[PDB]
Amino acid sequence: AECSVDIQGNDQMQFNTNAITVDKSCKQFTVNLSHPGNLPKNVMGHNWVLSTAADMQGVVTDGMASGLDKDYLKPDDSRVIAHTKLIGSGEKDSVTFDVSKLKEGEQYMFFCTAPGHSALMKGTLTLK
Amino acid sequence: AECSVDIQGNDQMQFNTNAITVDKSCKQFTVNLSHPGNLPKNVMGHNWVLSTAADMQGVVTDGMASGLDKDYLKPDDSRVIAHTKLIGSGEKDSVTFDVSKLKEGEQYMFFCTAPGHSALMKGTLTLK
Ligand SMILES: [Cu+2]
Ligand SMILES: [Cu+2]
């Protein structure tokens, strides 16, 4: 609906969509992170980070060397715009960020940071 | 088959099984690693590593820290009783090993070492 998305993350390492379209009719955009499945955090754990595709891998790498204890995300990451916290199945989590934080025509991509989940748990965030 | 498992590494981190048996009536065993799935090595690579349940941790670990140009295994890993290579989309590779390396009543474990894969990609080797 209006200024929020209902995004999923399953047991298959599948986000529900690779497409997030953020209208300019906004100042705040919310991400409704959900996880159907029956797998715990330490197994099929998901998250949601935002950043320039340029920096993506920076997040990923750093995220990786920071453990589950740091939500597979370096403490205070200047590349991380928005970001949720890791979540297991039947769990939930939201994040809000300022639409003004996203500069016109730049590469925006979303993705889980849990080791080797990056790959196919990715997306493009388009500022409409 | 006899001696013999063909295991399956698909795309959604699911090795076909969770248990492999190695009858005592063998000096040597042989494992068939297929790879159903359109996804490249670097993306969703698979292997087959064998060790006590005791070293697993150390092996998933050191492995991870070693890179796709080292099939996420640590050169000459003494903990590793036998391993295949890391296979891309549809690729194939086998391992053949001396069953006499195995001591009954020990907990043996098989698994992939690709970053956050052993989560789901692990199982049981039973010297029957
Ligand atoms: Cu994930
Ligand atoms: Cu694997």
Curated annotation (Swiss-Prot), chains A, B:
SUPFAM superfamilies listed in its UniProt record: Cupredoxins
Disulfide bonds: 3-26
Gene Ontology MF terms in the entry: copper ion binding; electron transfer activity; identical protein binding; transition metal ion binding; zinc ion binding
CDD domains (UniProt xref): Azurin (cd13922)
A cellular component term, taken from the record's GO annotations: periplasmic space
UniProt KW keywords: Copper, Disulfide bond, Electron transport, Metal-binding, Periplasm, Signal, Transport
Domain Plastocyanin-like: 1-128
Name assigned to this protein: Azurin
Organism: Pseudomonas aeruginosa (strain ATCC 15692 / DSM 22644 / CIP 104116 / JCM 14847 / LMG 12228 / 1C / PRS 101 / PAO1)
Upper taxonomic lineage: Bacteria, Pseudomonadati, Pseudomonadota, Gammaproteobacteria, Pseudomonadales
